[model samples]
Target: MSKEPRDPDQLYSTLKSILQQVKSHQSAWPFMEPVKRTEAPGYYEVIRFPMDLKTMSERLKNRYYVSKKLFMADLQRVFTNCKEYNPPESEYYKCANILEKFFFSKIKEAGLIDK
Candidate 1:
């Protein structure tokens, strides 16, 4: 009954832990909060949907993710938004690269997805 097969009422719990790991990562500094419009002009104009650690946690605490797929999708959005918003030469973009790699590694390590 505890075996995996789209049953992640427990998956949400595991997601909570994985989220904590990503947020705690040093490379995650730029991603801890939502992108500030004041600091980044035209950010919302280009990227309508934004994802950040705080936003993810808000959803998690509110039981927003009914399934693991939804949870993982938002995390991918975080990286995707950054990569699209900034150039590859920029620090923000580079951080996105590093953090993306790190996040998925943890995801796989937890047996959440395939390599």
Candidate 2:
């Protein structure tokens, strides 16, 4: 998609809602598992983040092809966007931190990152 970042507040809200759904379900959809299986010897779910931003088919067609650096850059953009709108002392910061932790933890749990 476009390299321009989506609105931070909107992105934050979207992530928050996604985390909530996954929490309620208590199971991840294994969106990245198939790709990992073919690309690497062992398989793992590396894309635990929600597909709310794009459909699973679309992501398969587009997002998964991008370099890891660009993938992380998009996430960083979301984080920076939120920070710009919410100061450290604000409750927004507190909520944002919780959301971020939950989001990444899911990814990590799927064996996508170091603990």
Q: Largest lDDT belongs to which candidate?
A: 1
- lDDT of candidate 2 over 38-85, digit per residue (tens): 643232343333232233224424334133343334434334444443
Error of 2 at 77 (Å): 2.2
TM-scores for candidates 1 onward, in order: 0.81, 0.37
Q: Using alpha carbons, what is the TM-score of model 2?
A: 0.37
lDDT of 1 by residue, 19-100 (tens): 7888888778877887777887567888776678788877887568535467678888888876777775677787777877
Error of 2 at 90 (Å): 2.6
Please state the error at residue 27 of candidate 1 in Å.
1.4
RMSD in order of candidates: 4.1, 17.2
